[PDB]
Design a protein around this ligand. Structure first.
Ligand SMILES: [Mg+2]
Ligand SMILES: [Mg+2]
Ligand SMILES: [Mg+2]
Ligand SMILES: [Mg+2]
Ligand SMILES: [Mg+2]
Ligand SMILES: [Mg+2]
Ligand SMILES: [Mg+2]
Ligand SMILES: [Mg+2]
Ligand SMILES: [Mg+2]
Ligand SMILES: [Mg+2]
Ligand SMILES: [Mg+2]
Ligand SMILES: [Mg+2]
Ligand SMILES: [Mg+2]
Ligand SMILES: [Mg+2]
Ligand SMILES: [Mg+2]
Ligand SMILES: [Mg+2]
Ligand SMILES: [Mg+2]
Ligand SMILES: [Mg+2]
Ligand SMILES: [Mg+2]
Ligand SMILES: [Mg+2]
Ligand SMILES: [Mg+2]
Ligand SMILES: [Mg+2]
Ligand SMILES: [Mg+2]
Ligand SMILES: [Mg+2]
Ligand SMILES: [Mg+2]
Ligand SMILES: [Mg+2]
Ligand SMILES: [Mg+2]
Ligand SMILES: [Mg+2]
Ligand SMILES: [Mg+2]
Ligand SMILES: [Mg+2]
Ligand SMILES: [Mg+2]
Ligand SMILES: [Mg+2]
Ligand SMILES: [Mg+2]
Ligand SMILES: [Mg+2]
Ligand SMILES: [Mg+2]
Ligand SMILES: [Mg+2]
Ligand SMILES: [Mg+2]
Ligand SMILES: [Mg+2]
Ligand SMILES: [Mg+2]
Ligand SMILES: [Mg+2]
Ligand SMILES: [Mg+2]
Ligand SMILES: [Mg+2]
Ligand SMILES: [Mg+2]
Ligand SMILES: [Mg+2]
Ligand SMILES: [Mg+2]
Ligand SMILES: [Mg+2]
Ligand SMILES: [Mg+2]
Ligand SMILES: [Mg+2]
Ligand SMILES: [Mg+2]
Lengths: 148, 185, 223, 51, 53, 157
RNA sequence: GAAAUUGUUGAAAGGGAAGGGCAUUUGAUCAGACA
RNA sequence: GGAAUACUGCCAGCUGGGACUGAGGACUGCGACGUAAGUCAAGGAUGCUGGCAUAAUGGUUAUAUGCCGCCCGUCUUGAAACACGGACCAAGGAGUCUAACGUCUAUGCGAGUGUUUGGGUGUAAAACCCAUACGCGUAAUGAAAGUGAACGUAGGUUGGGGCCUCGCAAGAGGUGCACAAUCGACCGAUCCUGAUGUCUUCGGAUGGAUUUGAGUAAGAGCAUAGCUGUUGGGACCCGAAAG
RNA sequence: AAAUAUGUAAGAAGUCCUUGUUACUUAAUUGAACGUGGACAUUUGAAUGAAGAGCUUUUAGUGGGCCAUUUUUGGUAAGC
RNA sequence: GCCCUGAAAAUGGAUGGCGCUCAAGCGUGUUACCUAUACUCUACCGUCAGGGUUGAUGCCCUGACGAGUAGGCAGG
């Protein structure tokens, strides 16, 4: 709101907060991004290194979500099981009946390897698991079921 | 006239009361200002200043942080104090029992202490039990993991995160970021 | 509750009575200590003369300095040294232990200050009337020996005269006993500086530099 | 609430530093020193009055 | 000087006496009696201006 | 309400004084003020009258007679500081004066018959003694004034 | 029915501007404290 | 030969005159003087007396006297300026609002968060309510194909507040979050190494490298708001010669 | 070969004893690093001061200067 | 050394003026005096700080400090 603004406090003092020498003029130094390569260069290197030039390949008509592969970690992985039903599978810890986790139904496209899991075996239906993702699942007696 | 050796009328750079208007926060202060003044209890002092702190200075302590702290030798039975809010953490599984004193508990965190058999205590309750702060563990969150801290000290060869509104190749990746185009940072 | 006050009261009234006669004992011993010290030097001078020798006094260990110059237009080296001796203000003054380490702080500072060798009668009259202590910053007037004893007692020095004795003798706690004294804020000399123009050496026309014994007449007009 | 100057106000001069009492009462603001007869030898005055 | 200081503190602690290992600066001076035997003060005068060229 | 009320208000209890240490000690008059010294009255109704000093009252004033039958000044109070104390002194031995004190002149148009007697009483004694030294009666009837060139910082009085 | 600006009347001041500040004189004027 | 005096210095020696000040408001303190009971000039003025009880003090104002005072505003190293604007008065008259942002702050919730595109609803632009998605965050790293975060109580060392034990204390030992320094481990990039295999050229185990990254190492974010700063906009207000 | 100016040092992050680690290095169990365990805290190793020290973020204004002493360059000189 | 000559410019005129000659001049010494928003002590306003204590933006005790364009913040 207005009455909180400094420009209210500057009523009565000439020149607002702007200084009497260099005043406040329209656009000294140029509008917008002007002179990023000349008089603003010191600012652009240092705080925006790499601003100018090209890098990489062009990609024509790239559609996002062609790449859609949301990632999930063994760090959690057990959150996909509803919290009530969680404790029963955890105490059970049997290969005969082990919980089914369909990661793609939960909206994940790849299972990554962060964290540790408890020794309970699980059934992970997923596309794309990382190599350490699988290996920790099997060490707890689980398996990875490739799906799509 | 004087030749001063120090800036006159310079005020202490420390918070004298919290910037909040929350009346219950004020009360918690009013308690601990009494506590701090009339007791020795260095614990009380720290908590007094702790109550003044700004949100950026009161980063959440997760429920796993408390758990790993209780694994210090001889700490198992202390009661944790967190001036701030405590968060739930799914990543741990076996959580101990103990007791926690905090400003605020998140739903998950409350259920996760309680379902472990523990207890939820506010700071006034903690006060009545430990007037001198006996057998307390004080915990602070990691305030330096904040996003904004990525950008502090930005510079050439400083390795910090530039301020950028969009990310990928062709976004500030070229001239000055790589030996091949000009120089490197 | 009604009786136990006369317990704590009659207790301190006796521990006061005790601290008192200790000061009365000490101050008597200081009086003898000075009276005989001076008296020896006099005769030692007489003795040298009778022997056809010359007795040379020992150089003074103790020097009092008051800043007679304003706070404007001071060179930066002297401006530091002036602060490091705690004279940031015109006419204010402190004591300095005399060693070669502080002797050069008197060389660099010389055009802005007048200094000399203070007499017992000065140091006494300084500390009684203008004596102030430094207690958690704040400047405390020394009106009761307890104030001294509180802060300086760990060194000995429970009496304003123990302070005065500690000063004029230099000795073990001079550093701390001195630094306890708040710099003496003096008025301008009543009766004048006796020279037309101050800032010139005492040798040259007075005011600024080491006037040796003459610092005393000065400080006592200011004080 | 008032600085009082011990060099005036005898109440205070006694409040700090007893032996003020003794000092005054024994005088010794005065107190003649003893009387000695040492005479400076010869060479001293020979050089004192020298050119 | 730390060798010297360590060894000074040892010969002091072995005898149980005071240490004082921190140097003091030069202290002003002490009272002397200089004699006149053999030295009679030889009195001096300023000298008239003289050209030597 | 035309003006929002105070959230505080002060206490209408009146505080008691602290217990003040000021003794009432007795006045010391300057050496020159001794009963029977002729005074020069420096101000007041009778200013410039030459007057005889009798008794030092307990309210710090001086008992003055002057005496009435000579200069018209009656028995009366006078203040220490408004008086020049001369070097000529008539002896008051023969003057009772024990009866005149603070409450004598106590405010209690007309002149009391005891006053008038006490006047003649004290004066008949005084005029007697004044007659012992020649010209002292004339001197006391005359009025004092600084003539041209007088210098009170020189004049001995 | 404001201001600039003007008529009359009333008080005042004024030896080449006026107006300001501190201080008291003078004149004019006026508030505050007791039954 | 015996003094005196000057000079300089000291006295917790005694005393005369004048000036300004009287803060504080029961008591607490340090004392002094007394054989004593008491007394005091000892942590800030009391006693006694007089006059007036109103324009008397005082305020206001006009005048007079003494001393002092250049015209503001702006640019400027420098303005009273022989720099510029301003004859006078009134009323108007200039850092805004928006989109997206940096910090900091407060609030809500928190590994999540944002009800208001929309639907329900209504006392009807409000308030109240909600399904699916979506945006940001929860994974980084390569131009890219792609790969993708625990040797170890999520490591060692050096400091760390708090807490714990011993201790009457002074201290001694234990644990040590945040944070800082430093050595290590993990993930991507780059360069080696090239095992078991295999279809013979695919595959890439294992162990390395003064190399590298806006990374991991028991999450902090998301949203709403405020000051301040950013940029685009007529962009604090008025102004070109032009096109 | 000065004066004034200037670098470094005046301890606990130190010192000493004992003897662990290693692919470095040595002919060598030699050294070089980094450690375990033991010893020494009064003055805790000059003076003075210190009214506190350390640390982070963020943003205004400025980027015409001028003068005095001394040092000093161009100029006969200058309110250059 | 002081004094004289050397020593010529434009409105009328400046040891600041008047004036001053064993000075009111020049050199030097000795005191006494005058008076700054500076020093010293007190009262008051405010700012900062330290401490106490259950109109809480509270009440109390204690010390130090106070220049300012351009500019920042703060209370109004
Ligand atoms: Mg402003
Ligand atoms: Mg301003
Ligand atoms: Mg203006
Ligand atoms: Mg500004
Ligand atoms: Mg401007
Ligand atoms: Mg500018
Ligand atoms: Mg160019
Ligand atoms: Mg992991
Ligand atoms: Mg005088
Ligand atoms: Mg002078
Ligand atoms: Mg007659
Ligand atoms: Mg009008
Ligand atoms: Mg007209
Ligand atoms: Mg008028
Ligand atoms: Mg006029
Ligand atoms: Mg004034
Ligand atoms: Mg003699
Ligand atoms: Mg004398
Ligand atoms: Mg009073
Ligand atoms: Mg008046
Ligand atoms: Mg003038
Ligand atoms: Mg201009
Ligand atoms: Mg310009
Ligand atoms: Mg101007
Ligand atoms: Mg001009
Ligand atoms: Mg112009
Ligand atoms: Mg004009
Ligand atoms: Mg415009
Ligand atoms: Mg804008
Ligand atoms: Mg046109
Ligand atoms: Mg064109
Ligand atoms: Mg800038
Ligand atoms: Mg410029
Ligand atoms: Mg000039
Ligand atoms: Mg002339
Ligand atoms: Mg003159
Ligand atoms: Mg003469
Ligand atoms: Mg002369
Ligand atoms: Mg003024
Ligand atoms: Mg305070
Ligand atoms: Mg504190
Ligand atoms: Mg407080
Ligand atoms: Mg309270
Ligand atoms: Mg409060
Ligand atoms: Mg306030
Ligand atoms: Mg408070
Ligand atoms: Mg000041
Ligand atoms: Mg200011
Ligand atoms: Mg300032």
């Amino acid at each position: 709101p207005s009455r909180f603004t400094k420009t209210r406090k500057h009523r009565g003092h000439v020149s607002a907060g702007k200084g009497r020498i260099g005043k406040h003029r329209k656009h000294p130094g140029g509008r917008g991004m002007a002179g990023g390569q000349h008089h603003h260069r010191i600012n652009m290197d240092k705080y925006h290194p790499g601003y100018f030039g090209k890098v990489g390949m062009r990609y024509f008509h790239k559609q996002q979500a062609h790449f859609w592969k949301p990632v999930l970690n063994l760090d959690k992985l057990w959150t996909l099981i509803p919290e009530d039903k969680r404790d029963q599978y955890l105490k059970s810890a049997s290969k005969e009946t082990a919980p089914v986790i369909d990661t793609l139904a939960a909206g994940y496209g790849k299972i990554l390897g962060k964290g540790r899991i408890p020794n309970v075996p699980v059934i992970v239906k997923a596309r794309f698991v990382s190599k350490l993702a699988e290996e920790k699942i099997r060490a707890a007696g689980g398996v990875v079921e490739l799906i799509a | 006239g004087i030749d001063h050796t120090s800036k006159q009328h310079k005020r202490s750079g420390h918070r004298t009361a919290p910037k909040s208007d929350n009346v219950y926060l004020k009360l918690l202060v009013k308690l601990y200002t009494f506590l701090a003044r009339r007791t020795d209890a260095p614990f009380n002092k720290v908590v007094l200043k702790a109550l003044f702190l700004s949100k950026i200075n009161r980063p959440p302590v997760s429920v796993s942080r408390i758990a790993r702290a209780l694994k210090q030798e001889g700490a198992a039975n202390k009661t944790v104090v967190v001036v701030g809010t405590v968060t739930d953490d799914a990543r741990i599984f076996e959580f101990p029992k103990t007791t926690v004193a905090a400003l605020r508990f998140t739903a998950g965190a409350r259920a996760k202490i309680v379902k472990a058999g523990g207890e939820c205590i506010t700071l006034d309750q903690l006060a009545v039990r430990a007037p001198k702060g006996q057998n307390t563990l004080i915990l602070r969150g990691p305030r330096n993991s904040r996003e904004a801290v990525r950008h502090f000290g930005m510079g050439p060869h400083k390795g910090k995160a530039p301020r950028i509104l969009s990310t990928g190749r062709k976004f500030e990746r070229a001239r000055g970021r790589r030996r091949s185009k000009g120089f490197k940072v | 509750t009604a009786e136990q006050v006369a317990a704590e009261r009659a207790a301190r009234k006796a521990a006061n009575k005790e601290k008192r006669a200790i000061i009365l004992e000490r101050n008597a011993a200081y009086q003898k200590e000075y009276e005989t010290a001076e008296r020896n030097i006099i005769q030692a001078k007489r003795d040298a003369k009778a022997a056809g020798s010359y007795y040379v006094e020992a150089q003074h260990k103790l020097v009092f300095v008051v800043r007679i110059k304003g706070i404007n237009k001071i060179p930066p080296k002297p401006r530091k040294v002036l602060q490091l001796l705690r004279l940031t203000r015109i006419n204010s003054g402190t004591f300095v232990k005399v060693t070669k380490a502080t002797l050069e702080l008197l060389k660099l500072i010389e055009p802005y200050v007048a200094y000399g060798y203070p007499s017992y009668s000065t140091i006494r009259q300084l500390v009684y009337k203008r004596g102030f202590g430094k207690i958690n910053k704040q400047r405390v007037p020394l009106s009761d020996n307890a104030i001294i004893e509180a802060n300086l007692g760990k060194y000995g020095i429970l009496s304003i005269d123990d302070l005065i004795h500690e000063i004029i003798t230099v000795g073990p706690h001079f550093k701390q006993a001195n630094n306890f004294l708040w710099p003496f804020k003096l008025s301008n000399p009543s009766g004048g500086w006796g020279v037309p123009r101050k800032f010139k050496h005492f040798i040259q026309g007075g005011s600024f530099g080491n006037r040796e014994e003459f610092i005393n007449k000065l400080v006592k007009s200011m004080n | 609430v008032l600085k009082k100057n011990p060099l005036k106000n005898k109440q205070v001069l006694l409040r700090l530093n007893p032996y003020a009492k003794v000092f005054a009462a024994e005088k010794l603001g005065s107190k003649k020193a003893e009387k000695t007869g040492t005479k400076p030898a010869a060479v001293f005055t020979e050089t004192l009055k020298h050119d | 000087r730390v060798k010297a200081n360590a060894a000074k503190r040892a010969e002091a602690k072995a005898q149980g006496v005071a240490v004082q290992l921190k140097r003091q600066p030069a202290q002003p001076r002490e009272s002397r009696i200089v004699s006149t035997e053999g030295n009679v003060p030889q009195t001096l005068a300023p000298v008239p201006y003289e050209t030597f060229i | 309400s035309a003006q929002k009320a105070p959230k505080w208000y002060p206490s209408e209890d009146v505080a008691a004084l602290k217990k003040t240490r000021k003794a009432a000690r007795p006045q010391k008059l300057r050496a020159s003020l001794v009963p029977g010294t002729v005074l020069i009255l420096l101000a007041g109704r009778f200013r410039g009258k030459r007057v005889v000093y009798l008794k030092h009252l307990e309210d710090n004033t001086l008992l003055i007679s002057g005496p009435f039958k000579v200069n018209g000044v009656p028995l009366r109070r006078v203040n220490a500081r408004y008086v020049i104390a001369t070097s000529t002194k008539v002896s008051v031995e023969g003057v009772n004066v024990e009866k005149f004190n603070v409450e004598y002149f106590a405010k209690e148009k007309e002149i009391k018959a005891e006053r008038v007697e006490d006047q003649k009483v004290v004066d008949k004694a005084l005029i007697a003694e004044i007659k012992k030294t020649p010209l002292l009666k004339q001197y006391l009837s005359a009025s004092f004034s600084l003539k041209n060139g007088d210098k009170p910082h020189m004049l001995k009085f």
